[PDB]
Amino acid sequence: DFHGIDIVINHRLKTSKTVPDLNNCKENYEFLIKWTDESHLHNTWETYESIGQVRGLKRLDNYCKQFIIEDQQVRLDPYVTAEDIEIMDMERERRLDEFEEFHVPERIIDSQRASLEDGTSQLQYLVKWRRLNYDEATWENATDIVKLAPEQVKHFQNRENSKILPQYSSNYTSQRPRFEKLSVQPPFIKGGELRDFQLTGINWMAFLWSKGDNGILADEMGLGKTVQTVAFISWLIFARRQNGPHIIVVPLSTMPAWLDTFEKWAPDLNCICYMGNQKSRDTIREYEFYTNPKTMKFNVLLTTYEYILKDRAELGSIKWQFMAVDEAHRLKNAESSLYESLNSFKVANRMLITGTPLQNNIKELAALVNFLMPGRFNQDEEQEEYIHDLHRRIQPFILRRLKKDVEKSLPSKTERILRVELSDVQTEYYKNILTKNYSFSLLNIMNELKKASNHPYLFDNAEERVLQKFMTRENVLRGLIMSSGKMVLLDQLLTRLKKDGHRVLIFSQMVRMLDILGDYLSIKGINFQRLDGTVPSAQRRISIDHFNSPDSNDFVFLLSTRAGGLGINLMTADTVVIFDSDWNPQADLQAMARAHRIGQKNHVMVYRLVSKDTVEEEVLERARKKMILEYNEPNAGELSAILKFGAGNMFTATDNQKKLEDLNLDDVLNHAEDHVTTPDLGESHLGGEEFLKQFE
Ligand SMILES: Nc1ncnc2c1ncn2[C@@H]1O[C@H](COP(=O)(O)OP(=O)(O)OP(O)(O)=S)[C@@H](O)[C@H]1O
């Protein structure tokens, strides 16, 4: 009824200036439109006079006002950094990449053929839109859905036959099946792999079920503990044929995650997301059960804690088999309505997830245990043994492994901090920049130093000034390398590891700096490409695929640090360089794990570069010290400190050059620090005393 403009997605050029005004827009562009009373396949490429009179029309103009005009305007400002731009760029991307998800269908809810205004009737569905929500799902024409979304359809019909429905569940009376052991991953888990330590995992949760005991998965974060739940569900269903209704509780941050993981490793499963509190609640009830006013038609549902109260009412009275919960450090508390309402639930079983063993908590120690098993349990010496007893007293219910325990299983790596002097040049630059000041601005001041520390060429007269020796090309490198602490080092670092054929990644904050290496490499004659927000998706894939080319001649590959946070896999490199790092260390690890990507085949060597007695190390010693408190810019406040000395202890220039002069790679590397980035993780709880018996 209310027909016209839901929202405006995009725009472009046509069939043939730089600061445009509305009129330009109006005249040179077609625009993308989700119409109201519609959905995202029904987006059209229209122009002003191709659409005409339509309700809430202004809200289109408003798009130009911001996304063409005032965006394009804003860029001009010379204080807008290059760095700044690529953000604005990666930004468009991110937005329009979300929209691309709304004509990707993920479920189907009702085969219900609709009569049409002829005498004709087509089979129309009822489509759940990915990244979208339960409110706002649309009936759409079968005929073309299917030729777009075969499986989710294929799934649909099966979705009410599926052998694995909930009531075909086998319910163990006096007894319950023998504990067993699976030395190889059972076919019915169809995703891909799972390193032995994965198997071992499921085995454990398994064996435990076949004791009637629930346990806790606390292996250090990012460690597969999702796949390890997913898988272990497949088992409950497909291996103890009981699979009534299952429920996993999740961080809203990561449910988009789980969902993929499911239709990756347990594709055949019928699992249900719980997003929306309003029109969802009501929508879902029309999907969850069977058509009658108590057949639950779904294998697995998933939520945020949120809906465990807004909807404890309905959910409370549901007969549940298995319950897990991710990043559930969240439930140390015994009053928090999670607890009170999760015990308000009917569960045969509990797996629990956290990346942590308890220390302090005595009451937490209780609340967690007393949650998953309602049947458990002075001078400071006496509260110290009690916590220590009840420590071991629950060894059997814990699984905890760390990096080192699965080093055999995984692409090990190695973070080294190579710290260099500043070139005689750099020194003097720094040192002068200092002079000028202390007389939000502090920022560029930081920047100038940051720049100085990386390379003098970032600055304007630099190169011109350096080479007062006229104009030769050998020389152009000669000064280009040697005026820079980092470069000098790096120079023979490549030289050397490019003798060992190490395929090499390099990141920086400063795209300008990238340019400069960009220079370096072409002069030296080395193959590579460059990346960052500037190059459009379309492009990227090609600078990428050429590096990962079956036997490519690219033997290095430049990137923005922010480029990293992308989603881009370059395992074809065995070695990462951080030229310089962020307020945020994670930004560096994102970028790291573009070759630390859990389908890596080498040992990954990671060199973080810092210049000695520079502000640089304060930024990095900051990084760690935050990025230990775990599981994007320095404060103006704190910033005062970080700058306000490092200045006269910054020694000679000609000294520093002397150092650089006959610097030796090896020493630098055998002197190299280590970047310590993990609270001592505690000890490995490698399984339950019992279980262990059954494996050897
Ligand atoms: N066998 C596997 N094959 C391929 N990818 C895997 C495997 N196991 C884990 N992963 C991936 O490793 C990445 C990080 O693992 P996650 O399962 O998200 O970590 P996690 O231990 O669940 O962390 P949480 O949920 O915060 S405690 C994910 O992209 C997983 O899909």
Domain boundaries, given as residue ranges, for the chain: 1-103, 104-159, 160-410+680-696, 411-679
* Ligand 1 atom nearest 225 alpha carbon: 21
Name the residue at shortest CA distance from atom 3 of ligand 1.
Answer: 193
Ranges of beta strands (E only) in 583-637 are 604-611
> What is the Rg, in whole angstroms, of the alpha carbon atoms belonging to the chain?
30
Q: Taking the CB of residue 606, how many other CB atoms lie within 10 A of it? A: 21
Both tokens assigned to 303: 């939520």
Long-range contact set of residues 311-317: C-beta below 8 Å, sequence gap at least 24 = 311/277, 311/281, 312/341, 312/344, 314/281, 314/285, 315/345, 316/341, 316/344, 316/345
Name the residue at shortest CA distance from atom 1 of ligand 1.
Answer: 194
Torsion angles phi and psi, residue 576, rounded to 5: -115, 140
Name the residue at shortest CA distance from atom 20 of ligand 1.
Answer: 222
Do residues 358 and 368 make contact, with C-beta atoms less than 8 angstroms apart? yes
Topology (CATH) of 1-103: OB fold (Dihydrolipoamide Acetyltransferase, E2P) (2.40.50)
d(C-alpha 130, C-alpha 151), whole Å: 14
Both tokens assigned to 629: 């408190």
Q: DSSP class of residue 374?
A: S
Measured in residues, the chain has a length of 696
CA distances from 325 to 216, 304, 541 (A): 10, 10, 37
Name the residue at shortest CA distance from atom 18 of ligand 1.
Answer: 222
- Å from CA of 608 to ligand 1 middle: 26
Q: DSSP class of residue 114?
A: E
Q: Please state the separation of Cα 248 from the chain's center in Å.
A: 21
Do residues 8 and 31 make contact, with C-beta atoms less than 8 angstroms apart? yes
Pick the closest to residue 619 from 693, 524, 509 (CA basis).
509
CA distances from 630 to 220, 331, 528, 667, 679 (A): 12, 17, 36, 33, 9
Topology (CATH) of 104-159: OB fold (Dihydrolipoamide Acetyltransferase, E2P) (2.40.50)
Does ligand 1 have an atom closer than 6 angstroms to the CB of 326?
A: yes
Burial of 691 (0-12, 13-18, 19+ CB in 10 A): buried
d(C-alpha 5, C-alpha 38), whole Å: 10
Ranges of beta strands (E only) in 26-78 are 30-34, 44-46
Burial of 669 (0-12, 13-18, 19+ CB in 10 A): middle
* Ligand 1 atom nearest 192 alpha carbon: 3
Q: Taking the CB of residue 297, how many other CB atoms lie within 10 A of it? A: 18
CA distances from 386 to 360, 390, 396 (A): 12, 6, 17
Identical fold at 1-103 and 411-679? Answer: no
Pick the closest to residue 557 from 627, 471, 494, 613 (CA basis).
494
CA distances from 116 to 41, 109, 123, 141 (A): 20, 20, 10, 12
For 160-410+680-696, CATH number?
Answer: 3.40.50.10810
d(C-alpha 140, C-alpha 146), whole Å: 11
User: What b/e readout covers 83-104, taking b as 16+ CB neighbours within 10 angstroms?
Assistant: bebbeeebeeeeeeeebeebbe
d(C-alpha 104, C-alpha 137), whole Å: 12
Q: DSSP class of residue 220?
A: P
Do residues 363 and 334 make contact, with C-beta atoms less than 8 angstroms apart? yes
User: What b/e readout covers 133-163, taking b as 16+ CB neighbours within 10 angstroms?
Assistant: ebeebbebebeebbeebeebbebbeebeebe
Reduced to 3 states (helix: H, G, I; strand: E, B; else coil), residue 344 is coil
Reduced to 3 states (helix: H, G, I; strand: E, B; else coil), residue 448 is helix
- Å from CA of 225 to ligand 1 middle: 6
d(C-alpha 693, C-alpha 696), whole Å: 6
User: What b/e readout covers 501-521, taking b as 16+ CB neighbours within 10 angstroms?
Assistant: ebbbbbbbbbbbbbbbbbebb
d(C-alpha 608, C-alpha 614), whole Å: 14
d(C-alpha 619, C-alpha 598), whole Å: 29
Does ligand 1 have an atom closer than 6 angstroms to the CB of 630?
A: no
d(C-alpha 628, C-alpha 679), whole Å: 6
Q: Taking the CB of residue 262, how many other CB atoms lie within 10 A of it? A: 24
Does ligand 1 have an atom closer than 6 angstroms to the CB of 353?
A: yes
| Chain interruptions in the chain, by residue before each (C–N > 2.5 Å) | 16, 293, 377, 439, 470, 631
Torsion angles phi and psi, residue 407, rounded to 5: -60, -35
Name the residue at shortest CA distance from atom 12 of ligand 1.
Answer: 224
Q: Taking the CB of residue 631, how many other CB atoms lie within 10 A of it? A: 11
Q: Taking the CB of residue 309, how many other CB atoms lie within 10 A of it? A: 15
d(C-alpha 9, C-alpha 100), whole Å: 10
Topology (CATH) of 411-679: Rossmann fold (3.40.50)
Q: In what order do the strands lie in the sheet with 604-611?
A: 529-531, 557-560, 504-508, 575-578, 604-611, 413-420, 673-674
Residues with Cβ within 8 Å of residue 389, at least 6 apart in sequence: none
Does ligand 1 have an atom closer than 6 angstroms to the CB of 679?
A: no
Q: 352 has which bridge partners?
A: 216
Q: Please state the separation of Cα 141 from the chain's center in Å.
A: 35
Q: Taking the CB of residue 539, how many other CB atoms lie within 10 A of it? A: 11
Pick the closest to residue 487 from 539, 420, 412, 535 (CA basis).
420
Does ligand 1 have an atom closer than 6 angstroms to the CB of 222?
A: yes
Both tokens assigned to 547: 């590096």
Testing ligand 1's pocket by substitution, the residue of 227, 260, 352 carrying the most ligand atoms inside 8 A of its CB is: 227
Both tokens assigned to 624: 């760690």
d(C-alpha 63, C-alpha 283), whole Å: 32
d(C-alpha 602, C-alpha 599), whole Å: 9
d(C-alpha 182, C-alpha 291), whole Å: 39
Please list the alpha-helical segments (H only) found in 317-441: 337-342, 363-372, 382-392, 424-436
Q: State which amino acid sits at residue 305.
A: Y
User: What b/e readout covers 64-76, taking b as 16+ CB neighbours within 10 angstroms?
Assistant: beebbbeeeeeee
Positive or negative torsion for Cα 311, 316, 317, 321: positive
- Å from CA of 228 to ligand 1 middle: 8
Both tokens assigned to 125: 């569905």
Residues with Cβ within 8 Å of residue 167, at least 6 apart in sequence: 244, 295
d(C-alpha 618, C-alpha 12), whole Å: 46
d(C-alpha 399, C-alpha 198), whole Å: 11
Q: 398 has which bridge partners?
A: 216
Residues with Cβ within 8 Å of residue 24, at least 6 apart in sequence: 17, 68
Do residues 169 and 160 make contact, with C-beta atoms less than 8 angstroms apart? no
Instruction: Characterize the bridge pairing of strands 673-674 and 413-420.
Output: antiparallel
Ranges of beta strands (E only) in 623-692 are 673-674, 685-686
Q: Taking the CB of residue 607, how many other CB atoms lie within 10 A of it? A: 23
d(C-alpha 583, C-alpha 367), whole Å: 37
| Way it was determined | X-ray
Q: 323 has which bridge partners?
A: 247, 350
Both tokens assigned to 502: 């190490």
d(C-alpha 489, C-alpha 497), whole Å: 12
d(C-alpha 646, C-alpha 607), whole Å: 24
